[PDB]
Design an enzyme around this catalytic site. Structure first.
Site, mmCIF file in Angstrom:
data_model
loop_
_atom_site.group_PDB
_atom_site.id
_atom_site.type_symbol
_atom_site.label_atom_id
_atom_site.label_comp_id
_atom_site.label_asym_id
_atom_site.label_seq_id
_atom_site.Cartn_x
_atom_site.Cartn_y
_atom_site.Cartn_z
ATOM 1 N N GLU A 99 -31.345 7.079 8.604
ATOM 2 C CA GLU A 99 -31.453 8.075 9.678
ATOM 3 C C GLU A 99 -32.912 8.448 9.894
ATOM 4 O OE1 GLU A 99 -27.225 8.793 10.780
ATOM 5 O OE2 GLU A 99 -29.144 9.157 11.761
ATOM 6 N N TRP A 100 -33.250 8.759 11.143
ATOM 7 C CA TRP A 100 -34.630 9.016 11.539
ATOM 8 C C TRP A 100 -35.292 10.123 10.707
ATOM 9 C CZ3 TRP A 100 -37.148 13.242 13.761
ATOM 10 C CH2 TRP A 100 -36.333 14.361 14.004
ATOM 11 N N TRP A 141 -19.158 1.613 2.743
ATOM 12 C CA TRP A 141 -18.179 0.728 3.380
ATOM 13 C C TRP A 141 -18.753 -0.024 4.595
ATOM 14 C CZ3 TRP A 141 -13.569 -1.398 2.366
ATOM 15 C CH2 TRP A 141 -12.823 -1.922 3.438
ATOM 16 N N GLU A 143 -19.701 -2.470 -1.500
ATOM 17 C CA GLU A 143 -18.265 -2.569 -1.285
ATOM 18 C C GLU A 143 -17.908 -3.923 -0.652
ATOM 19 O OE1 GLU A 143 -16.602 1.002 0.498
ATOM 20 O OE2 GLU A 143 -17.750 2.313 -0.821
ATOM 21 N N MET A 147 -13.470 5.177 -6.888
ATOM 22 C CA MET A 147 -13.043 5.667 -5.582
ATOM 23 C C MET A 147 -11.522 5.700 -5.459
ATOM 24 S SD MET A 147 -16.087 4.207 -3.112
ATOM 25 C CE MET A 147 -16.052 2.500 -3.665
ATOM 26 N N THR A 148 -10.930 6.639 -6.191
ATOM 27 C CA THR A 148 -9.482 6.806 -6.271
ATOM 28 C C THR A 148 -8.975 7.605 -5.073
ATOM 29 O OG1 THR A 148 -9.925 8.610 -7.832
ATOM 30 C CG2 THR A 148 -9.121 6.522 -8.757
ATOM 31 N N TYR A 149 -9.136 7.008 -3.898
ATOM 32 C CA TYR A 149 -8.617 7.545 -2.641
ATOM 33 C C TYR A 149 -8.564 6.408 -1.623
ATOM 34 C CZ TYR A 149 -13.702 8.360 -2.658
ATOM 35 O OH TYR A 149 -15.060 8.229 -2.802
ATOM 36 N N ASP A 150 -8.200 6.723 -0.378
ATOM 37 C CA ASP A 150 -7.850 5.709 0.635
ATOM 38 C C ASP A 150 -6.802 4.736 0.090
ATOM 39 O OD1 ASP A 150 -9.909 6.825 2.370
ATOM 40 O OD2 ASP A 150 -11.353 5.625 1.219
HETATM 41 C C1 LIG Z 1 -16.535 7.567 12.390
HETATM 42 O O1 LIG Z 1 -17.616 8.222 12.862
HETATM 43 C C2 LIG Z 1 -18.273 9.141 11.952
HETATM 44 C C3 LIG Z 1 -19.499 8.505 11.212
HETATM 45 O O2 LIG Z 1 -19.002 7.561 10.205
HETATM 46 C C4 LIG Z 1 -20.050 7.081 9.317
HETATM 47 O O3 LIG Z 1 -19.363 6.124 8.540
HETATM 48 C C5 LIG Z 1 -18.845 6.595 7.311
HETATM 49 C C6 LIG Z 1 -17.375 7.230 7.430
HETATM 50 O O4 LIG Z 1 -16.451 6.273 7.946
HETATM 51 C C7 LIG Z 1 -16.944 7.681 6.010
HETATM 52 N N1 LIG Z 1 -15.496 8.013 5.903
HETATM 53 C C8 LIG Z 1 -15.088 9.180 5.450
HETATM 54 C C9 LIG Z 1 -13.582 9.391 5.369
HETATM 55 O O5 LIG Z 1 -15.877 10.063 5.106
HETATM 56 C C10 LIG Z 1 -17.123 6.507 5.002
HETATM 57 O O6 LIG Z 1 -16.885 7.029 3.714
HETATM 58 C C11 LIG Z 1 -16.676 6.106 2.660
HETATM 59 C C12 LIG Z 1 -17.948 5.582 1.970
HETATM 60 O O7 LIG Z 1 -18.503 4.464 2.664
HETATM 61 C C13 LIG Z 1 -17.437 5.064 0.626
HETATM 62 N N2 LIG Z 1 -18.401 5.283 -0.405
HETATM 63 C C14 LIG Z 1 -17.939 6.194 -1.268
HETATM 64 N N3 LIG Z 1 -18.658 6.729 -2.285
HETATM 65 C C15 LIG Z 1 -18.006 7.632 -3.268
HETATM 66 C C16 LIG Z 1 -19.997 6.222 -2.668
HETATM 67 O O8 LIG Z 1 -16.711 6.702 -0.911
HETATM 68 C C17 LIG Z 1 -16.262 5.999 0.273
HETATM 69 C C18 LIG Z 1 -16.108 6.911 1.494
HETATM 70 C C19 LIG Z 1 -14.615 7.379 1.706
HETATM 71 O O9 LIG Z 1 -13.769 6.232 1.981
HETATM 72 O O10 LIG Z 1 -18.446 5.956 5.033
HETATM 73 C C20 LIG Z 1 -18.828 5.405 6.291
HETATM 74 C C21 LIG Z 1 -20.196 4.764 6.093
HETATM 75 O O11 LIG Z 1 -20.055 3.725 5.084
HETATM 76 C C22 LIG Z 1 -21.166 6.355 10.120
HETATM 77 N N4 LIG Z 1 -22.261 6.072 9.200
HETATM 78 C C23 LIG Z 1 -22.598 4.898 8.712
HETATM 79 C C24 LIG Z 1 -23.799 4.968 7.771
HETATM 80 O O12 LIG Z 1 -22.025 3.861 8.958
HETATM 81 C C25 LIG Z 1 -21.646 7.125 11.346
HETATM 82 O O13 LIG Z 1 -22.425 8.227 10.915
HETATM 83 C C26 LIG Z 1 -20.421 7.614 12.153
HETATM 84 O O14 LIG Z 1 -20.902 8.331 13.258
#
Ligand SMILES: COC[C@H]1O[C@@H](O[C@H]2[C@@H](O)[C@@H](NC(C)=O)[C@H](O[C@H]3[C@H](O)[C@H]4N=C(N(C)C)O[C@H]4[C@@H]3CO)O[C@@H]2CO)[C@H](NC(C)=O)[C@H](O)[C@@H]1O
Length: 377
Positions: free
Chosen positions: A49-50, A78, A119, A189-192
């Site tokens: 992010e900026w 993810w 992941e 990551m005990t969820y989803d």
């Molecule tokens: C959908 O628009 C909102 C926003 O999403 C950002 O992507 C993130 C979300 O989809 C997160 N989901 C939730 C339910 O929070 C997602 O979270 C994942 C994370 O990648 C995994 N890593 C962990 N931990 C513990 C390290 O846990 C998992 C959680 C829960 O499943 O993460 C994605 C990003 O990977 C967008 N951002 C990015 C960076 O892609 C963007 O901001 C978008 O507008």
């Protein structure tokens, strides 16, 4: 016990009361805070992010209010996929370039460690050799961290990893005993564990199996997953249980078929704050409950659900967080991690359960209410 809480750098874009910045974090709430996410460019760690540098400063500045607080930076996620990780581990020279950049980055921005969120090795495009190459990467990082700590005479940077809960993903992804030797903590990551992709209602983070969970479905619960990691070589004390402050929602195929395993036609509506399809933040769920949704309790699995019209949500509340915390202690795990701090009812205005009700439940249950909270010298 550790109470490790993830902060996300996109929470800043949420409208009105949803907007969440580093200074909205109570520095006394968690033992560890982890910043999601860093990226990668030319085998080196980078911002995404900026305003990440400004945010790092505010984030790590929280340590000026709690002398015991430690911070980590998570790389990946993810949506990051596997391609940059695969390329980075593919050669020793690329791993060295990466490790060098990480030491520089963490020290520069005042983080206490790195959380790997690849992941996952061996899946999602990542080839089979990455399972072992991940172990190699982690060991090399750990040893580089050990050497750096002594050369500059400061406490050693931590290396941790967020890891899969899916059994197939674990088997193709991790050399558990070897990996466990070099990681400080294993963030499971005990969820989803269920979602609309299955075509029926299911819980996000059920503690135990539901009676109808047969075959490989019997693996889709916190208890099985944590014990799988333990039984296959990870020390319980390094294992950190995953706690979600969000739920998965569904569109019910039949509005008066509302139990676990009810037919669904797709993901439920994005929330008005987080704006994530098929996902509601805990505080977004509180609005759903306020607006007249019927409360359900999934007794076998020790987790709540709620429904109204053709919308159904599986989630976690104070009750389920407490039950899981007690279970965690009985099983002598290292503690809990929370995804995410910005999805809890931080303002306290949605749920009427106090500020950060879900994380506060964990702080209390894990014996951290009396934890030291004073600015450093
Ligand atoms: C959908 O628009 C909102 C926003 O999403 C950002 O992507 C993130 C979300 O989809 C997160 N989901 C939730 C339910 O929070 C997602 O979270 C994942 C994370 O990648 C995994 N890593 C962990 N931990 C513990 C390290 O846990 C998992 C959680 C829960 O499943 O993460 C994605 C990003 O990977 C967008 N951002 C990015 C960076 O892609 C963007 O901001 C978008 O507008």
């Amino acid at each position: 016990y550790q109470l490790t809480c993830y902060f996300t750098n996109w929470a800043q874009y949420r409208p009105g009361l949803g907007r969440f910045m580093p200074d909205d974090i109570n520095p006394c709430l968690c033992t560890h805070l982890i910043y999601a996410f860093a990226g990668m460019q030319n085998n080196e760690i980078t911002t995404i992010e900026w305003n990440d540098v400004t945010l790092y400063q505010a984030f790590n500045g929280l340590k000026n209010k709690n002398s015991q607080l430690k911070t980590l930076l998570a790389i990946g996620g993810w949506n990051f996929g596997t391609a940059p990780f695969t390329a980075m581990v593919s050669t020793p020279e690329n791993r060295q370039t990466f490790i060098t950049s990480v030491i520089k980055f963490l020290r520069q921005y005042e983080f206490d460690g790195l959380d790997f969120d690849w992941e996952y090795p061996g899946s999602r495009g990542s080839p089979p050799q990455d399972k072992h190459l991940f172990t190699v990467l982690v060991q090399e990082m750990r040893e580089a961290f050990e050497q750096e700590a002594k050369q500059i005479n400061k406490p050693r940077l931590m290396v941790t990893a967020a890891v899969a809960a899916g059994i197939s993903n674990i088997q193709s992804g991790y050399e558990i005993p070897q990996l466990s030797q070099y990681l400080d903590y294993i963030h499971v990551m005990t969820y989803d564990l269920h979602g609309s992709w299955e075509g029926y209602t299911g819980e996000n983070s059920p503690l135990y199996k539901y009676p109808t969970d047969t075959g490989s479905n019997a693996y889709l619960n916190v208890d099985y997953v944590m014990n799988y990691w333990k039984d296959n070589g990870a020390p319980a004390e390094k294992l950190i249980v995953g706690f979600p402050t969000y739920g998965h929602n569904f569109i019910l195929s039949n509005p008066s078929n509302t139990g676990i395993g009810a037919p669904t036609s797709g993901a439920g509506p994005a929330g008005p704050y987080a704006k994530e399809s098929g996902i509601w933040a805990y505080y977004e769920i509180c609005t759903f409950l306020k607006n007249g949704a019927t409360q359900g309790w999934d007794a076998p699995q020790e987790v709540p659900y709620a429904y109204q019209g053709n919308v159904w949500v599986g989630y976690d509340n104070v009750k389920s967080f407490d039950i899981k915390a007690q279970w965690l202690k009985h099983n002598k795990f290292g503690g809990a991690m929370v995804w995410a701090i910005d999805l809890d009812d931080f303002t306290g205005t949605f749920c009427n359960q106090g500020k950060f009700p879900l994380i506060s439940t964990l702080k209390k249950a894990l014996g951290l209410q009396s934890a030291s909270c004073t600015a450093p010298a």
